Amino acid sequence: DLPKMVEGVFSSEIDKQIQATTKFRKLLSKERNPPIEEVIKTGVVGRFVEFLRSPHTLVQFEAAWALTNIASGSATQTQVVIEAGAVPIFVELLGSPEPDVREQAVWALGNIAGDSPQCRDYVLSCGALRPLLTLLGDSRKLSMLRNATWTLSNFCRGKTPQPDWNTIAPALPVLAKLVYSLDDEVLIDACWAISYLSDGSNDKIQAVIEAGIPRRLVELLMHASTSVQTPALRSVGNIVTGDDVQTQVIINCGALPCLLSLLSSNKDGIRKEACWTISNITAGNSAQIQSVIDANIIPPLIHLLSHADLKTRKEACWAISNATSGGLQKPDQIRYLVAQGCIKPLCDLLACPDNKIIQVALDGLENILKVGELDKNAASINRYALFIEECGGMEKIHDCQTNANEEIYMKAYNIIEKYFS
């Protein structure tokens, strides 16, 4: 009975407080549709926050659990807990002598920070990160390690805005240790946290590298669980969006044979992100393109160019086109791409409704044509231009002149002028 429970919570006797708070905790823990709104309307949330400072650890714990579950709700329900002043006290409780209280405070802060980037930043501003990281280095209890890694991943999550970098960067040496966890849940959440932190400017990627994280990430690419593979792969993909030296760390850690394997993943999303990752490697220097070629990645990429879903094809298109960038330095790369059958699938992509894909396919084809012309002058026709012509490719380049954009139908015109006139 709710009114009697409220009466108990507003009592000054610890036993009545605990009995009533426990009843609220149980209400808020029910299987479906906890009556969070109803509980808030009774006005007990402020009392729960008071109980967090009680010398009786049991009422601390029960109140923390009730508050955790109120914060598991909507943005406005979470705001009720914030407004009541729970967060600075939860941060203090991360240093409680009682492990169950510490653990519940971790969970509450996870829920609150999980609500939004703004809530995340408020939690960080109250100094939650350092005591959380300390727990992650000290605890031997699996449930705590799991909960604290999850909460840490929420401290790292979000892009509107990203958290302050110097504020969150202390997480990296701790995450570097967590990716060696023997527990899959810790592994998954640590990898997700890294996937958030590694998405951004290259100084952030450098920080990830200097923490020593890439080597284990590359090893986790072949983890049995797709739930580990996915954020590990997103992280590796983020790192190769860096400069050539940063990208080379990933190659040197042995990622290319892993990436070859991941192209045959049973998960569409993994195949797609593997293609994306490879594309940012073939966006690299001549030696890095050569590494991808030497890793036997080009034939499966060309396969995926034609088969697989549109999102995967788009990524494969970038990968193959990027690899045509070295026609001046090492034209043998393009001649190999052509020998492996890249021309027809690139031409078929000229009818893609996405203008970005059209431009990228045209870029690759022009790069191909330049080498074909080069081969002609040393010999007498452009063999590649002939290839494009009889596969129906020339017509598709011709229809690109009515594209209405800019660098596309200009590109298409110049190609027809220089190669098909």
Binding site: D199, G200, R234, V240, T241, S279, A283, W318, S325
Partner: peptide, 5 residues
């Protein structure tokens, strides 16, 4: 030349 998320 790199495409970030």
């Amino acid at each position: 030349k790199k495409r970030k998320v």
